[PDB]
Amino acid sequence: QSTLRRAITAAYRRPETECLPPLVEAATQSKEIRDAAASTARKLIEALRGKHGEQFVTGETIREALKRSKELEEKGFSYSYDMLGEAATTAADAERYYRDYESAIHAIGKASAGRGIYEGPGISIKLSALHPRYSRAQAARVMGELLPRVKALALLAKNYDIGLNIDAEEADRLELSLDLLEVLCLDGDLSGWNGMGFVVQAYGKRCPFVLDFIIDLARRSGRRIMVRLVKGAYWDAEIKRAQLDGLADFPVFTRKIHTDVSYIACAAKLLAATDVVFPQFATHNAQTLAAIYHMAGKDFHVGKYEFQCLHGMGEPLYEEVVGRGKLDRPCRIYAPVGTHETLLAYLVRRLLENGANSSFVHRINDPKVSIDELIADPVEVV
Amino acid sequence: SRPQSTLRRAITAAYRRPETECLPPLVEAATQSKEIRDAAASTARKLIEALRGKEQFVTGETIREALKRSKELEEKGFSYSYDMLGEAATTAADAERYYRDYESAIHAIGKASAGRGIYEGPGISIKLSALHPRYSRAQAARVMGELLPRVKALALLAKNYDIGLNIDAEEADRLELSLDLLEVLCLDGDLSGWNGMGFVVQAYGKRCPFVLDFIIDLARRSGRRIMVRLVKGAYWDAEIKRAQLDGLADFPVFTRKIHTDVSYIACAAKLLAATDVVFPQFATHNAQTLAAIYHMAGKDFHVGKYEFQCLHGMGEPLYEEVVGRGKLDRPCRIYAPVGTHETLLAYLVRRLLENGANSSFVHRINDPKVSIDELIADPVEVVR
Numbered sequence: 227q228s229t230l231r232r233a234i235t236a237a238y239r240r241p242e243t244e245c246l247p248p249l250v251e252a253a254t255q256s257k258e259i260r261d262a263a264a265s266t267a268r269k270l271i272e273a274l275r276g277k278h279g280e281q282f283v284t285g286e287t288i289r290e291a292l293k294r295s296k297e298l299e300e301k302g303f304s305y306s307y308d309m310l311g312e313a314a315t316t317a318a319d320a321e322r323y324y325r326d327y328e329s330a331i332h333a334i335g336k337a338s339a340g341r342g343i344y345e346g347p348g349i350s351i352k353l354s355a356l357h358p359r360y361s362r363a364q365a366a367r368v369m370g371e372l373l374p375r376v377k378a379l380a381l382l383a384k385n386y387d388i389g390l391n392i393d394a395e396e397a398d399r400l401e402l403s404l405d406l407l408e409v410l411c412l413d414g415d416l417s418g419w420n421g422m423g424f425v426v427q428a429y430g431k432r433c434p435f436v437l438d439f440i441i442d443l444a445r446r447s448g449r450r451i452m453v454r455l456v457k458g459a460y461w462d463a464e465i466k467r468a469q470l471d472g473l474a475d476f477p478v479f480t481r482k483i484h485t486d487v488s489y490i491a492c493a494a495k496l497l498a499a500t501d502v503v504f505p506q507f508a509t510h511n512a513q514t515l516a517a518i519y520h521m522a523g524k525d526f527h528v529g530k531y532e533f534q535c536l537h538g539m540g541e542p543l544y545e546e547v548v549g550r551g552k553l554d555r556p557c558r559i560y561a562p563v564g565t566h567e568t569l570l571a572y573l574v575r576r577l578l579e580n581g582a583n584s585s586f587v588h589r590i591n592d593p594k595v596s597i598d599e600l601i602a603d604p605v606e607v608v
Numbered sequence: 609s610r611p612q613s614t615l616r617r618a619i620t621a622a623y624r625r626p627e628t629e630c631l632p633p634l635v636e637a638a639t640q641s642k643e644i645r646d647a648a649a650s651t652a653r654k655l656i657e658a659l660r661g662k663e664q665f666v667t668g669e670t671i672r673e674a675l676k677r678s679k680e681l682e683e684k685g686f687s688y689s690y691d692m693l694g695e696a697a698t699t700a701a702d703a704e705r706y707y708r709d710y711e712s713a714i715h716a717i718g719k720a721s722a723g724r725g726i727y728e729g730p731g732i733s734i735k736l737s738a739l740h741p742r743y744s745r746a747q748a749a750r751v752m753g754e755l756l757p758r759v760k761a762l763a764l765l766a767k768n769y770d771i772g773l774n775i776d777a778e779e780a781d782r783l784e785l786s787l788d789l790l791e792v793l794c795l796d797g798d799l800s801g802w803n804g805m806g807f808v809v810q811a812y813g814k815r816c817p818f819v820l821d822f823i824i825d826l827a828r829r830s831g832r833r834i835m836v837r838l839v840k841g842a843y844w845d846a847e848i849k850r851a852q853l854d855g856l857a858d859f860p861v862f863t864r865k866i867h868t869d870v871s872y873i874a875c876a877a878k879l880l881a882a883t884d885v886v887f888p889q890f891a892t893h894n895a896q897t898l899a900a901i902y903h904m905a906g907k908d909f910h911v912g913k914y915e916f917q918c919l920h921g922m923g924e925p926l927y928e929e930v931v932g933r934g935k936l937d938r939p940c941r942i943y944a945p946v947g948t949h950e951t952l953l954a955y956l957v958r959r960l961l962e963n964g965a966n967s968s969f970v971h972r973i974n975d976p977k978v979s980i981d982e983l984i985a986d987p988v989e990v991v992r
């Protein structure tokens with residue numbers, strides 16, 4: 227319990243109208259940056275509009291996925307591999323997912339061949355795959371059996387010097403996963419390894435306060451935490467859970483423009499802290515990308531920050547970003563690995579993403595949507 | 609005793625009966641002779657070899673557009689049931705809006721029907737969750753008393769045009785209320801002389817055969833020939849998750865996919881023996897299921913005896929090998945969603961969970977590791 231942790235708990239269901247003023251202020255950029263980002267975003271979108279579930283899986287096995295990664299790695303992309311599987315319901319399921327993560331780390335770490343955590347591939351895990359009652363069991367007990375398993379995987383990732391990222395899932399599990407992150411970052415057995423990563427979801431009202439906590443945790447622990455900033459994949463489920471809960475105040479925003487403002491405000495916070503964290507800006511939205519690209523300034527080196535995208539979704543955009551003929555910024559591809567069976571839940575989230583009229587990836591193909599609208603700055607519209 | 613005490617008690621008794629206890633009667637009723645099994649395998653092989661030979665889910669943004677796009681397949685012998693996309697109304701104004709959409713749709717469908725009747729002409733499908741703002745949460749007394757006048761009014765309009773009006777099936781915990789509503793409507797004298805009322809029953813539910821017993825007996829005492837759409841069920845993943853959260857030791861649906869297949873065939877046998885008082889509507893995209901029912905029904909057929917059904921954008925390739933004199937000479941009604949993205953997502957997700965699952969026929973037909981031998985195998989032989 228600390229002041230920084232208390233700010234997280236207090237924001238859980240803070241009224242949406244009270245959350246926004248600090249985010250609007252933090253997301254307000256200078257005119258020069260807004261004009262430059264509008265220019266870059268227009269160029270990216272004009273390139274995109276000149277362009278156009280097997281498409282979402284990189285390979286059935288990690289051996290297959292590693293082989294298919296060589297082409298894009300020489301173009302300037304990196305990878306984070308996702309062994310598909312989540313929401314384990316039995317001990318045997320959780321055990322199989324653990325062994326899949328373990329064998330993937332060995333294969334990825336050997337494939338990395340000393341490239342390190344920024345140039346080389348990493349892995350992403352879901353805590354719900356590793357505990358059989360993750361969402362339906364008491365938080366303290368879950369962390370007690372979960373911690374040995376995650377620490378063991380982190381130690382393997384440290385052995386090979388690869389990244390290991392904890393994906394973010396439902397809002398009611400943020401606190402648990404955050405407690406696990408702190409324990410690992412203070413664990414002396416993992417010293418000297420900067421590969422521990424953590425996702426934060428900008429559609430959550432707690433997002434800026436989680437980031438404050440993580441930035442301070444990195445500074446005091448000496449671990450350069452990899453922080454993947456996403457908007458959030460579970461919006462429809464969080465709304466439906468909240469409506470059943472009968473609460474007037476949800477843990478997430480209810481207007482897409484509020485999430486957009488929150489993302490930019492949180493990106494500003496992360497870019498001001500690149501000494502102690504490694505920001506990873508996961509988005510397919512060209513306006514969001516352009517804003518962050520200019521927010522970050524003229525100084526860049528590999529390891530300062532990176533972009534990220536999903537396999538099968540982000541390559542048309544990020545082919546206009548990676549490489550010396552483009553923006554010369556790196557992008558890490560999130561790469562699902564597994565069978566069609568384990569793919570289903572991920573596919574459903576991709577459908578809610580790709581099929582929503584509010585999504586950038588749908589609007590880019592919508593004849594009713596002008597380029598002028600696609601490059602609108604969310605602060606100026608909110 | 610209470611009215612229909614025995615039949616109603618049998619439904620309640622099955623609600624969460626152990627799965628192993630549910631299956632033996634279903635396996636017996638779903639067992640067919642070797643000769644019929646041989647003929648059905650031949651038909652299913654033909655259908656699949658035809659199939660493996662050769663936005664997509666919405667028929668139009670408005671009912672007028674959807675009706676225009678229906679002419680081509682109706683000329684071939686298909687019929688339609690239109691689904692104005694919308695469900696799980698959260699406000700009272702949302703429910704009134706959905707009501708007015710159904711009302712306007714019935715007028716348009718009824719005009720387009722132009723007197724073709726409930727079997728050859730188009731009909732409509734409704735969801736009760738669209739018509740009450742707290743359908744899943746509110747007490748049954750309140751839900752019934754506000755929903756019943758709305759559904760009666762829509763049924764009266766359907767009667768006035770002589771079109772079908774089907775109540776779709778949703779979550780398992782809504783079955784009891786929807787069935788009580790069906791009974792009150794079938795006994796309502798204001799709807800007399802119209803056989804267009806329809807009702808969906810989900811064969812992945814343990815209650816399915818006992819619900820069918822109740823519906824067949826209701827048809828006998830009401831004088832209505834009830835249209836019964838037999839489906840396997842669209843909410844399987846959600847029911848499993850809900851039952852786990854609810855702390856249940858036994859679920860209201862089957863957990864082995866072939867058990868649902870056996871349940872479906874057993875319930876088709878029950879419906880096919882009652883075509884005097886119900887109109888069976890066999891909704892499936894599975895060519896093995898279709899072939900089994902086609903042969904179970906025997907050689908005598910006329911339009912109005914029974915029909916098949918399929919979803920727009922999923923079933924037309926299969927049923928183009930079924931409709932028509934040169935094929936199987938059996939009709940098929942296409943379920944036709946009408947709307948925009950503001951109501952499409954929830955349908956898409958149920959469709960993706962259907963199309964994306966390793967166990968689904970529509971996925972297995974495209975799976976190189978699944979032989980035609982396995983696709984035509986009778987599931988009843990696997991469990992017998």
Ligand SMILES: Cc1cc2c(cc1C)N(CCC=O)c1c([nH]c(=O)[nH]c1=O)N2C[C@H](O)[C@H](O)[C@H](O)COP(=O)(O)OP(=O)(O)OC[C@H]1O[C@@H](n2cnc3c(N)ncnc32)[C@H](O)[C@@H]1O
Nearest residue numbers: 393394456457458459480481482508509510511534585586
């Ligand atoms: C690119 C990426 C995304 C995600 C993950 C990694 C990478 C590299 N990651 C792992 C995969 C898990 O699904 C991850 C994600 N989400 C999450 O909660 N935890 C994780 O660990 N990833 C998905 C990500 O959150 C996001 O959904 C997508 O990238 C799309 O967002 P993007 O910035 O590309 O696109 P926009 O279209 O500008 O935004 C879409 C998002 O907007 C939000 N939304 C939509 N309607 C809203 C309303 N009415 N109110 C509030 N917010 C709304 C949603 O978040 C929507 O996704």
Ligand SMILES: Cc1cc2c(cc1C)N(CCC=O)c1c([nH]c(=O)[nH]c1=O)N2C[C@H](O)[C@H](O)[C@H](O)COP(=O)(O)OP(=O)(O)OC[C@H]1O[C@@H](n2cnc3c(N)ncnc32)[C@H](O)[C@@H]1O
Nearest residue numbers: 776777839840841842863864865891892893894917968969
């Ligand atoms: C064709 C059709 C389908 C449905 C409806 C109308 C028509 C014309 N109808 C309205 C649309 C609603 O979404 C309807 C449906 N479902 C429902 O519960 N209520 C309704 O009012 N419709 C969908 C239908 O139930 C079904 O999902 C599909 O047609 C697919 O079934 P089909 O016979 O095509 O395919 P099969 O692949 O042989 O079987 C798939 C089904 O098997 C069940 N399943 C999946 N996993 C299972 C496990 N582990 N145990 C037990 N059962 C399992 C599911 O029912 C799955 O759909």
